[PDB]
Design a protein around this ligand. Structure first.
Ligand code: CLA
Ligand code: CLA
Ligand code: CLA
Ligand code: CLA
Ligand code: CLA
Ligand code: CLA
Ligand SMILES: CC(/C=C/C=C(C)/C=C/[C@@]12O[C@]1(C)C[C@@H](O)CC2(C)C)=C\C=C\C=C(C)\C=C\C=C(C)\C=C\[C@@]12O[C@]1(C)C[C@@H](O)CC2(C)C
Ligand SMILES: CC(/C=C/C=C(C)/C=C/[C@@]12O[C@]1(C)C[C@@H](O)CC2(C)C)=C\C=C\C=C(C)\C=C\C=C(C)\C=C\[C@@]12O[C@]1(C)C[C@@H](O)CC2(C)C
Ligand SMILES: CC(/C=C/C=C(C)/C=C/[C@@]12O[C@]1(C)C[C@@H](O)CC2(C)C)=C\C=C\C=C(C)\C=C\C=C(C)\C=C\[C@@]12O[C@]1(C)C[C@@H](O)CC2(C)C
Ligand SMILES: CC1=C(/C=C/C(C)=C/C=C/C(C)=C/C=C/C=C(C)/C=C/C=C(C)/C=C/C2=C(C)CCCC2(C)C)C(C)(C)CCC1
Ligand SMILES: CC1=C(/C=C/C(C)=C/C=C/C(C)=C/C=C/C=C(C)/C=C/C=C(C)/C=C/C2=C(C)CCCC2(C)C)C(C)(C)CCC1
Ligand SMILES: CCCCCCCCCCCCO[C@H]1O[C@H](CO)[C@@H](O[C@H]2O[C@H](CO)[C@@H](O)[C@H](O)[C@H]2O)[C@H](O)[C@H]1O
Lengths: 94, 63, 41, 165, 74, 217, 194, 74, 194
């Protein structure tokens, strides 16, 4: 069953459809700074824990940082392990 | 002149009033520039037993 | 006897008469058709 | 055979209950003479009991393990297995009469709203008007539907409301 | 702070049905819930009581603990 | 005035010009069901459909009943003819009822939409030219055209009496079907056999001498 | 405005006449809002194209002898060795499931990023039949009507199978063998009282 | 109460809870004979669970000595 | 205006005299609307041409000895091997059914796209008999009258077969053998009691 094949393929497919397919949609959706403004305008330490203290710059041209990577690879690992587990009991219901 | 006539039916648009959205008969409108000149008599009394109350020109509407 | 029949038209007298009537109707229905658990007739 | 319920004609607990009630009544009957007033009363009670049991078993009622008739409220199970006279038919039988009462009272209220003192026509009933409306309220469903379709059954936003709407 | 995820204000202000069947919908409700501790507390007590009743209804039908359901007093 | 109760106070809604045009207006509305003019229009339509359906059905009951009492036919009793006809049929009664409900719902929905807006099924392009003949006439319930082959509605001299004959025979036939039902449930015999048994002994064979109609008597 | 759907019923005011397939059928008033109506106009054509393909496939798989549409996916369960036109295909359920996810994700994301696009001429109109003309409107009407018919037909596939257990062509043969003893009324499902 | 007082308990209004009993039979209680979903040994819901929780669930719910979906009546 | 259909009955005002076959027969007033009347005028000639061909065929199949019109389609059922003039034809029911669908679809679509066309001279008038002249009107009248007669005759075929079970020529021979013992009144179908 080659779990390396399965999980590498799931992660690669999800990273691909996150980079090439659903990146524009996710950027259109995640741009909430709108009526929906910042959580805090204050200068307290606890107001700073809610600000984006570190913008994750990426030299990827489409803007695919370690957070997009983390998310799409997490979905890929989850789906690959789902495939492996549903194959683990050598069958499915219907 | 101001206010409905002295026998007209008038509907109340004051929310805190017992007769909100209820039709009462106008008794008198004070032509003096006073707050709440319209006197409206109602055929059903409120919780205090009162059948009339004073209403402004904003708080009354025809029919 | 306009006033007497006005009295008999009062809420308590009319209620008494009407509920005597309804109860008697139900009682006679239950005497002539006893124990009606279901509508089968 | 709806929910494990056996017909009361085939249940043995039902017959046991019948003979138990009859045994109670005849143990009361043994105390009196042949044709006493109590004897007549108890014989009539025994006849009513036997008739009641026969008429419940004849009506296709379903019985439990206790031998007591159980009613089927569900339409679809009542109409599939012939138990519509238990809850389904008397449902509309009741609703007819209840809408009768409500429609008649409604029409009386609306008719006396026009008088100069509508309140004294409610503590002192206008009996001729009330009887007219009680007789002509037999067609309450049709009249109610036609009053619903004209938009005249409901009042619009002329009803009164508290300050926070 | 990592750039991904939802803002509850967006979810709430987006869920306005057409046909105006709920009017403005859930517009202005994030502020109402987040600024009122009694709204939060009522939601929390509602959920907690419902799941306490769930606990009660499920621990007797599906006894999770060994030699429970033979300890009747328990 | 031609009232149902010569001394009654006729309801005011049946004395209006819009109601006195209706066929068979004898002031009978003791329950006030047609006090609403729209309801009166709808119920006039219901009366006409019930009356024509009942006329057709009661004819199909007692004409073949009289002809099988006279030997010209062997049609079973109307309360037996469904079983007999379905045991000689090509189809189960379920498929029959389905086809019937489709074919009847079509024409009854057309009639419905013509009641909702009179003269609306003549919207050009709806049918294949036949919608031209589906506008009806000035009077609702009296469609005419293809429903009037012999052209008896084109007089304006026999029209009121044609209406009256229809509605009166139809009320009579509705009563006749109710009587078929009650007589079957109270006697167990056919309507023509009930007539025969009444005509052989009227004073001891009637609804007063069956055990159903008057339990107190 | 092509048709009325209810002769005599005057059309709703929110359905434009230029809309392909407008018969005035909106009794629930679902398309009263213009944005809702635009989304519904796209989704109707999409559902209809997918249903046309689906009915074509469910009919071609049975008319050619490879079973019915319902029994085709029982190679994943009940063994394996998918087939197409009899040619067995070297893909198990997981591989083609994942490839379908990937491919349809790419395709429908390219379609969704286009906003509301229902008639994308060009790469999807190579033979040049629709250029927003008289023929284009007529062909849009034809497309949407065949799509509505195919949607009804697939709903019929599903219902007839859930009631009878047969295939579309098998049920058609049953009906032609006994039009009155084999219909929706004669199964013990559709009309229960029958 | 009045019927048991008059010694005629067969005149009671004993409405069988057929909706909750139908639900119970959907979970595999074969006491009522509805044979709907998991009490139906030919359904897909029943077939797809047999490699899974359903053997134990159906041995537990048809045991009338536990409190898993007790038998109910009027 | 050729004939009256009811001597004394004055003609309906919606039936033009220039219409071929106008006897003033519209008692149901079906052709009161001009568009309805145009559709009906086309459909009458179409039904009539089809009925002329159909009666000619039902008579030629029995006068030549190949059975009646009703029993001809019982090769599809009850076996196979269609025949024509005795020549067996290598087509089963499905093949010729599909080819008929295709061919008649093409033909009648070409006819329907023409709008209302009932007299298409040219490719359908090679011998040049009708050029919208005196002869053309007279021949249109002849066509529509023979078509009405053939429609009546095919309705007669169907009714006489449903009542008797015979063919047209067989029923004609029965009637000529016993004009009074073999007619519509002597079967136990047409007249109800006898
Ligand atoms: C809401 C709860 C409830 C319900 C549903 C019932 C239901 C019933 N009870 Mg119970 N009961 C209740 C509360 C309730 N009761 C309470 C609170 C008490 C204590 C006071 C009792 C004490 C009690 C006793 C002691 C008895 C009952 C009985 C009955 C049955 C009555 C059958 C009957 O009378 O047929 C009546 C049938 C009708 C068709 C009447 C309908 C009304 C009219 C007539 C219909 C209209 C016809 C027509 C249109 C009229 C034209 C106009 C007219 C003026 C001519 C029925 C099963 C009796 C029984 O046998 O139970 C098994 C019985 O003996 N009940
Ligand atoms: C439509 C007219 C009509 C006619 C001609 C008949 C005729 C007959 N019925 Mg039927 N019947 C009818 C309507 C009719 N019925 C209706 C509407 C009902 C339901 C209430 C019944 C219920 C009924 C029962 C339960 C029984 C009969 C019986 C009979 C027979 C004896 C008469 C009798 O007992 O009183 C008939 C009973 C009535 C309650 C009178 C209803 C008559 C209505 C109001 C219309 C006719 C009145 C009209 C002004 C005068 C006659 C019209 C006529 C010239 C057409 C007789 C053949 C009996 C039978 O079978 O004996 C062999 C019997 O047991 N009928
Ligand atoms: C109140 C909700 C409710 C519930 C939970 C059920 C529950 C059920 N119905 Mg019932 N049903 C209901 C209301 C309800 N019904 C109403 C209001 C109607 C319209 C009269 C029906 C008409 C109906 C039919 C016609 C049938 C059911 C059937 C069923 C079963 C599936 C199940 C026991 C079916 C059945 O008999 O189950 C075996 C069936 O055939 N139902
Ligand atoms: C279902 C059949 C039916 C319907 C719809 C009507 C409808 C109508 N009738 Mg007709 N009628 C009928 C049967 C019917 N009738 C029969 C059988 C008779 C003979 C007994 C009559 C005799 C009759 C007379 C003599 C007159 C009418 C009149 C009317 C009109 C005014 C009454 C009204 O609005 O009530 C609408 C009524 C209904 C909707 C029927 C409801 C059915 C109830 C609820 C059940 C009754 C059961 C019964 C007691 C058994 C209305 C168009 C009057 C008229 O023509 O004025 C224009 C008039 O003068 N009717
Ligand atoms: C509402 C009108 C109506 C309805 C529903 C029926 C219904 C029925 N009729 Mg009746 N019938 C009617 C009017 C009606 N009839 C009238 C007006 C007449 C006089 C012309 C007859 C004369 C008549 C006879 C003589 C016979 C029937 C028969 C039948 C049955 C078979 C139907 C049939 O022939 O196949 C459908 C026929 C089509 C043409 C379609 C069916 C119960 C037959 C029967 O009872 O068999 C058991 C039968 O022998 N009917
Ligand atoms: C899911 C498929 C689908 C969708 C999205 C639409 C959408 C639309 N249709 Mg189409 N239609 C469909 C299927 C669909 N239709 C089918 C199958 C038929 C044949 C029966 C038709 C026949 C039809 C006609 C004749 C007309 C329309 C029209 C319309 C438009 C206005 C009505 C509206 O807003 O409904 C929105 C509909 C939905 C949101 C679908 C919801 C479905 C509900 C939730 C469940 C229904 C279940 C069903 C009854 C049983 C399964 C809109 C663009 C009108 C128009 O102007 O066309 C341009 C018009 O005249 N439709
Ligand atoms: C449609 C109808 C009968 C139709 C019969 C049909 C199709 C019969 C069909 C068949 O038999 C055959 C042909 C052959 C059989 O083998 C098969 C069947 C199928 C069985 C009867 C309506 C019958 C309708 C009836 C009897 C209606 C009576 C209504 C009355 C009396 C109303 C009275 C009032 O409403 C007013 C008028 C005014 C108010 O103010 C006062 C009150 C009093 C309320
Ligand atoms: C029926 C349907 C929609 C019906 C909608 C209706 C009636 C809507 C009606 C209304 O909303 C309007 C219009 C206006 C409102 O005011 C009123 C109502 C009444 C509310 C959609 C079907 C839509 C159906 C679709 C999209 C079908 C697609 C099918 C496919 C892809 C099939 C694939 C396969 O069959 C093959 C090819 C081979 C097999 O082996 C494998 C599988 C996968 C099974
Ligand atoms: C009777 C008929 C139409 C009759 C219409 C009439 C009376 C209309 C009358 C009215 O409308 C008017 C005028 C005016 C209105 O105001 C009044 C009425 C009264 C309403 C049409 C037949 C129309 C008949 C037609 C079209 C027949 C076509 C037949 C064909 C094709 C036969 C083919 C075959 O027979 C062969 C060749 C060989 C076999 O083996 C196979 C088959 C297939 C069986
Ligand atoms: C250089 C470059 C490249 C490449 C790159 C790469 C290759 C990257 C990768 C990346 C990656 C490779 C990533 C990954 C990620 C991953 C992740 C992120 C994971 C996660 C996981 C998780 C989350 C888990 C979970 C879980 C567990 C723990 C267990 C079981 C259950 C579950 C599954 C749930 C190219 C050529 C394109 C070009 C450009 C640049
Ligand atoms: C006053 C107020 C308040 C409070 C309120 C409350 C308290 C409420 C409550 C509420 C509640 C307390 C609710 C509940 C609910 C419930 C539900 C809603 C349920 C549901 C269910 C479902 C949906 C199910 C499903 C299913 C089933 C049926 C079974 C099996 C499984 C499944 C899943 C399938 C607040 C604060 C807000 C503020 C405002 C005011
Ligand atoms: C039947 C079995 C298969 C089920 C289908 C699975 C669908 C799950 C969708 C997940 C991805 C959603 O994204 C996909 O749909 C969105 C609309 O809903 C599209 O969103 C689009 O329409 C929105 C309308 O305001 C706008 O944001 C943009 O025009 C556009 O982004 C995305 O451009 C598309 O990429």
């Amino acid at each position: 069953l080659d779990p390396q094949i399965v999980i590498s393929g799931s992660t690669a497919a999800f990273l691909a459809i996150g980079r090439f397919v659903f990146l524009g949609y996710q950027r259109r959706e995640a741009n909430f700074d709108s009526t929906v403004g910042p959580k805090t305008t204050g200068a307290t330490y606890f107001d700073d824990l809610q600000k984006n203290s570190t913008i994750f710059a990426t030299n990827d041209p489409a803007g695919f940082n370690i957070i997009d990577v983390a998310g799409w690879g997490a979905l890929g690992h989850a789906v690959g392990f789902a495939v492996l587990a549903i194959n683990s009991l050598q069958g499915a219901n219907l | 002149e101001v206010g409905p006539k002295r026998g007209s039916l008038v509907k109340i648009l004051r929310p805190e009033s017992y007769w909100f959205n209820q039709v009462g008969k106008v008794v008198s409108v004070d032509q003096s520039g006073v707050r709440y000149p319209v006197v409206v008599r109602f055929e059903n009394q409120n919780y205090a037993g009162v059948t009339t109350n004073n209403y402004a020109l904003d708080e009354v509407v025809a029919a | 006897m306009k006033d007497f029949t006005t009295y008999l038209s009062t809420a308590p007298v009319i209620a008494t008469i009407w509920f005597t009537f309804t109860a008697g109707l139900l009682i006679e229905i239950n005497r002539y058709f006893p124990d009606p658990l279901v509508f089968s007739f | 055979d709806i929910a494990g319920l056996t017909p009361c004609s085939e249940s043995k607990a039902y017959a046991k209950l019948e003979k138990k009630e009859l045994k109670t009544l005849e143990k009361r009957l043994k105390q009196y003479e042949a044709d006493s007033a109590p004897a007549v009363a108890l014989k009539a009670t025994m006849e009513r009991t036997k008739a009641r049991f026969a008429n419940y078993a004849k009506a296709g009622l379903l019985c439990g393990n206790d031998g007591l008739p159980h009613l089927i409220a569900d339409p679809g199970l009542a109409l599939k297995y012939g138990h519509a006279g238990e809850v389904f038919i008397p449902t509309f039988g009741f609703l007819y009469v209840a809408g009768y009462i409500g429609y008649v009272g409604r029409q009386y209220l609306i008719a006396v709203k026009g008088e100069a003192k509508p309140t004294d026509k409610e503590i002192i009933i206008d009996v001729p008007l009330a009887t007219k409306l009680a007789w002509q309220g037999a067609g309450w469903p049709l009249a109610a539907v036609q009053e619903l379709q004209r938009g005249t059954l409901l009042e619009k936003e002329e009803n009164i409301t508290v300050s926070p709407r | 702070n990592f750039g991904i995820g939802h803002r509850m204000q967006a979810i709430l202000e987006a869920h306005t049905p057409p046909s105006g069947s709920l009017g403005a919908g859930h517009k202005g409700l994030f502020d109402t819930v987040n600024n009122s501790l009694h709204f939060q507390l009522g939601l929390a007590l509602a959920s907690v009581g419902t799941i306490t009743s769930l606990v009660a209804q499920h621990m007797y039908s599906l006894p999770p603990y060994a030699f429970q359901a033979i300890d009747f007093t328990t | 005035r031609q009232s149902w109760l010569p001394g009654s106070q006729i309801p005011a809604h049946l004395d209006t010009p819009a109601a006195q045009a209706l066929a068979g207006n004898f002031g009978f509305d003791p329950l006030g069901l047609g006090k609403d003019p729209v309801a009166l229009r709808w119920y006039q339509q219901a009366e006409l459909i019930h009356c024509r359906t009942a006329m057709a059905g009661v004819a199909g009951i007692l004409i073949p009943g009289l002809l099988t009492k006279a030997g010209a036919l062997n049609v079973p009793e109307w309360y037996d003819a469904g079983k007999v006809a379905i045991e000689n049929s090509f189809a189960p009664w379920g498929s029959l009822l389905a086809v019937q409900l489709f074919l009847c719902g079509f024409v009854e929905a057309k009639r419905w939409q013509d009641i909702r807006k009179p003269g609306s099924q003549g919207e050009p392009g709806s049918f294949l030219g036949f919608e031209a003949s589906l506008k009806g006439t000035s009077e609702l319930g009296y469609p005419g055209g293809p429903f009037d082959p012999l052209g008896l509605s084109k007089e304006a001299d026999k029209w009121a009496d044609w209406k009256l004959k229809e509605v009166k025979n139809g009320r009579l036939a509705m009563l006749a079907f109710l009587g078929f039902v009650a007589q079957k449930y109270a006697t167990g015999a056919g309507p023509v056999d009930n007539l025969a048994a009444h005509l052989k002994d009227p004073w001891h064979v009637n609804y007063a001498t069956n055990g159903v109609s008057l339990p107190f008597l | 405005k092509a048709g009325n759907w209810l002769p005599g019923s005057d059309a709703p005011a929110w359905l434009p006449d230029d809309l392909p397939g407008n018969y005035g059928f909106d009794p629930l008033s679902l398309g009263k809002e213009p944005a809702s109506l635009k989304r519904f106009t796209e989704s109707e054509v999409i559902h209809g194209r997918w249903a046309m393909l689906g009915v074509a496939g469910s009919l071609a798989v049975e008319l050619l002898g490879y079973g019915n549409w319902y029994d085709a996916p029982l190679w994943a369960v009940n063994g394996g060795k998918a087939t197409w036109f009899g040619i067995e295909v070297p893909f198990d359920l997981n591989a083609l499931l994942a490839f379908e996810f990937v491919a349809m994700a790419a395709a429908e994301g390219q379609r969704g990023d286009a906003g509301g696009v229902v008639y994308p001429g060009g790469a999807f109109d190579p033979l040049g039949f629709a250029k927003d003309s008289s023929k284009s409107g007529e062909l849009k009407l034809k497309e949407i009507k065949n799509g509505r018919l195919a949607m009804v037909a697939f709903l019929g596939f599903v219902a007839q199978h859930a009631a009878t257990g047969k295939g579309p062509i098998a049920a058609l043969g049953e009906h032609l063998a006994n039009p009155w003893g084999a219909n929706f009324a004669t199964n013990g499902i559709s009309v229960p009282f029958f | 109460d009045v019927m048991q007082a008059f010694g005629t308990p067969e005149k009671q209004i004993l409405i069988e809870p057929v909706f909750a009993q139908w639900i119970q039979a959907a979970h595999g209680k074969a006491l009522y004979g509805f044979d709907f979903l998991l009490s139906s040994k030919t359904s897909a819901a029943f077939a797809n669970g047999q490699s899974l929780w359903l053997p134990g669930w159906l041995d537990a719910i048809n045991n009338n000595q536990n409190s898993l979906f007790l038998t109910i009546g009027p």
